[model samples]
Target: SAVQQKLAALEKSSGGRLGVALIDTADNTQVLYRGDERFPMCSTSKVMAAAAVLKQSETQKQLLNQPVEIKPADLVNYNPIAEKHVNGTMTLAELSAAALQYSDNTAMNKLIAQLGGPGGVTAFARAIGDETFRLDRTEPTLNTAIPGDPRDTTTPRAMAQTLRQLTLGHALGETQRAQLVTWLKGNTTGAASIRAGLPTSWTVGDKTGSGDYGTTNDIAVIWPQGRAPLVLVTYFTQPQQNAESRRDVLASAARIIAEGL
Candidate 1:
């Protein structure tokens, strides 16, 4: 139990709440710290959003080719690439990458809109046996992540386990999972978090999320050399004013998980 012990020590020193979960696909072993408690999902819901879209596309193959129109009003903040797609149309496939890789706010909203709403994302999650994942609002607003509000919250275990279902389970088709994981691996925003703890011999794909309440989260799927994949999810939060204190704990915990595994 050194894994849990070390992670607890890390949490104690964090000065904020910390949740960590690691799943080794090789044998389904789990090491968790506060893994069942709720934490705001932030932008990491982009992963679930992509999963919902991909899950739906499996039976409704035409959905992947459906055109999603982006109007000027559709634009949202933190949109690295969504801004450029304004007044134009893109496929669900394109927005999946934008939201996953770039964390584009606009493209994410557009994708959800195409599916019905936040409930659509939630629905797909339950269908996949992930009962705790939920998305109540779209971007900018969902980022509210009020100190303890349950809305847009998910447990670290749920997120990590669901990532396993998507990447290492049968919840998604091999081709569909590959596309989403590829986008995650290509993501440019998570360098200092989980990805920082891994070596060149490992392959990592992850989603990074943050919000107003000193919230930072990353849920990743990692492939260690000559081993089965591992799904790691870590969430950290402080008082809105205490951001800097726990700034690096999530990153540090990633190493702990890596070393322990």
Candidate 2:
């Protein structure tokens, strides 16, 4: 189809591996291009982590409003929020907002810690039907090269599957799912990925991931005017090293998918 050809063009032009999964929620139509290949999820893993915490909140007492002190050790270098508010205190909801909306590394690390480490996040993914998803490292270790480490990885299909379930209110209650979607729709990062490629009238709720080693990804639920929502996941690896080129590839992928629709 047109979508595959466009994706192939992107792969050929960039000399990178690309995995994509597009699902139309109205009729369950799907388009999968190299969807089984795994890629480092980077901050995209935050969505999974957030889901885990929200699931835990169901049985456990409410933790979102509880205040937690941010230690100096929790601060990381990349994100602005961490640099500005080191050693301060904030509610769990505030931490989650920073992590999801701004992709704050420090906020994510705190959430992972509160969840009892990476294994706890991984267990949540498994229970929610994404057995292949892994969360084995912290925020500071993100860009550090690791040989044969499969931590913090997911396939396009797996991510899209998780998104589909979330959209259908699986594993999370109505309130939790609404909260998650609100956060996702309010995401302020990755302006050059799926959101950039869509029409101005369309709305997208998405999470993006990037790394030092030419990894760029965006998983989104796109709402086109007068059409049912579409879940789109695009993952790229070993492309051009520059951020602009990598983001262009993602944007092009999204545009092509939209054109197909």
Candidate 3:
């Protein structure tokens, strides 16, 4: 309850709302605040898309190695890494890395197409025991983050639990799981959000989401040396019209969550 109180004060002071979820793998303890409320997923869907690609590769071994051609039409905005590969090709692994580590829009769209569509990633979430994570559209469009719109949104609890399962659930063979973890660790965009809230000594593998309507989020597997990893998700938003992502509010909320841990 102390955490709830602290977060409430932080939100009040920051003029924003926060949906947070924390999972202590070693202790099986959880702290949630508005964890069931959905906020736009933004680029966070890239994580689920990468996971789906990895999951599919389990049944079809060639899924990772086979070259997936990238045409100009497949490209989307915010694709710094993917634009270079236009009319070229990449394996699913390459695409996943571009998507996860760089948040490449084209990379995500290609991945979504590989599995079928946005629903493919959603199905993977359901199959993995999550009912609240959903991806209804591809990049650029998904980043619209229209105020109060329900599409392409997920709850903090669902995302934290899903990331925990993906990274620490002790799933079989550990191929897909390992691949996803490595990609998340390779992420180049999390320096100022949740990652900034913790001690520099702590290791973090995180995915960040930024969009219109004040959606600024981070979902991560945080590793404190010699102990089990912690799964934390923080979704910050403002219901006010014309709101933009607030990195300060997100990082501050993350600090509160980390302090509680």
Candidate 4:
């Protein structure tokens, strides 16, 4: 079976602890390795922020390109601020793109606030059937406001489910799903992992997350010409080593798994 092959390959090459979950877009076939453990999502939480924004637009039946004012006050407490920058006044579409494409914490936090605050985003998570995904705080709060823990958190399987829902146009409406794919395609922060696993011609719309104490992750929707779309969500966190080393391990395992697939 495909799962047996995937597991055998992983056992052969994965030198460190790794968690991965895969779902077939067309039929929902799945293969998971230590996929249930919840870990700090790091910047991969941008996907949640993006989803919340798109869902809001869908609810209001608003155009995704509609512009929103980025006031000076919005940039308060967020580093590498958005306001007064070259593209101060940007569209919601641009903001969504920036949030995922560059992992712009300032832009993401702003969008999170705009989507009726973090509580609202949490509500959207519940709507999507993810009760385990929490805000990392008791009340509405920006990711940066929380100390010690990373901004976002989730399990590998949960992220894969989110991606699957997005692809099937089940999380939000069709319009929101389209907007999410558009922003996801524009994602530019290609650190490794997914990319290392696929061919150059293949398309992988993905987000990467990294942190100080060895946290790295990649959640992707891979489109290969002849095969069905594959959702690959992988996470790595190790306190004993550096972030770069953890990233390398993740990328190596991803490459092996993708090759086997």
Candidate 5:
């Protein structure tokens, strides 16, 4: 198929390991290119964390509007939200918005702590039929020092499946699903990746992740004009791949998919 060939070409040009999965929601048609290979998720795990938090809120009867304080000691250096706010109080919903929209590491750590550490998010992933997706460390630890254990990771297939289930309102109620989707659509990051290739008529709700050595990933729900939305997950990793090249590869792949649609 042209789609498979085009994706293979893009992978070769990327000079890295690539895992990609695209699913057409209308007919459930899927295209997988090394989709089973696990790649470090970096900040992309925040989405999983957000989902777990929402589920916990549902079961524990906690309100999203409940206020929580941000301690000075809890602040991490990477996130703009923490840098700006420092010590302040915000509702759980507001914190989550910052985490998802800005990919704020500090806000994500707060959510992770609230859910009883990374294990809670991992359990949620497992319950959703993604056993390999693990969140073993928090952002501060994972970002600052060399971790003795594996960090968060997920395969393209697992991510796409998870997003699909979430989109279909599986496990999460309608309200929870809406909250997640709205946050995703408002994501202000990853502008040069999947979003670069999309036409002006389409809208992409996505999360971006990056790490040391050449890890770049973007997972998105692409809504073509007048068509059912589709899921696209692309993970790229190599020793020294440039960010620009990595993003170009993703953009090209997205363009190919869009043309087909």
Candidate 6:
């Protein structure tokens, strides 16, 4: 497929380490470019966290619109921009949206806490068939909270598998899955990765995650005409450790691959 040729070209052009996987849901055929390798997942871990919350809602039949008051102290771990939100009170829906759209750390932690903490999210991951995904707090201490643990990791194949389940109506229940996708659709900040690789006007629902180790990870469901709906996850790490620069690099590579597809 031209997809592989294009990705190889992009990889050579960028001089950055990359891993990419493409899954065709209709035929179950997969094309890989270092797809099996493990890498720091960065904010992409939020997808697992999001799925966890949606699953809880399904079990409890909880309406996402129900307001949840986030106290001042709890806001410490989230994106600084989220705290600046004019209205201090937000619904479960709003916070979830913020977590994905803004990649808010505090919002993620808060969601994890609301869902019974990190261990609970781990349980949700297992339910969705992500066996290798795990959370490890490096320096264990009841009082010392770690920010972004590199141990919070995942693989391209597993990430694509999770996306496949969502597409097949299997991850969360119908209503919850729809809402979860909606929240994903609202994520605008990481557009440079997966979205950048496709037609600007095309509809895509996805998330991007990057951080200090020069890691950039993106996962998306691409709907292209006359082709089977597919899942794409692209990750990159730079030797010099420039996350923002590497994000742009990943975005350019994704655009090339999608256009080739």
lDDT (C-alpha, whole model) for all candidates = 0.86, 0.81, 0.85, 0.69, 0.80, 0.70
TM-score of each: 0.95, 0.93, 0.96, 0.81, 0.92, 0.85
Q: Name model 2 segments beyond 4 Å from true.
A: 143-148, 239-245
- Ranking according to TM-score, highest score first: 3, 1, 2, 5, 6, 4
Clashes of 4: 1
Evaluate residue 259 in candidate 4 and report its C-alpha lDDT on the 0 to 100 scale.
Answer: 59
Can you list the residue pairs that collide in candidate 3? none
Model 1, global lDDT: 0.86
Candidate 1 clash figure, as a count: 0
lDDT by residue for model 6 over 60-152, one digit each (tens)?
676466676666666554465458653476777777888788887666766776767667777777877788666543111111212233366
lDDT of 1 at 151: 93
For candidate 4, what is the lDDT? Answer: 0.69
**Per-residue lDDT of 188-218 in model 2, one digit per residue for the tens?**
8868898888898998888888785677788
TM-score of the candidate numbered 3? 0.96
Q: Which has the greatest TM-score? A: 3
Over 4 Å off, model 4:
1-16, 63-66, 71-87, 137-151, 241-245
RMSD of each: 1.5, 1.9, 1.4, 4.1, 2.5, 4.0
lDDT string for model 5 (38-108, tens) is 77787778889888888877766666877778878877757777666767777778778888889888889
**Tens digit of lDDT per residue, candidate 1, span 119-219?**
98899899899999988999889977788799999999999889998988888988888878888889988888888877867888999988877888898
| Worst 10-residue lDDT window, candidate 5 | 141-150
Q: What is the lDDT of residue 104 in candidate 1?
A: 95
User: Model 4 clash pairs?
Assistant: 41-153
Q: What TM-score does model 2 achieve against the real structure? A: 0.93
* Worst lDDT 10-window in candidate 4: 138-147
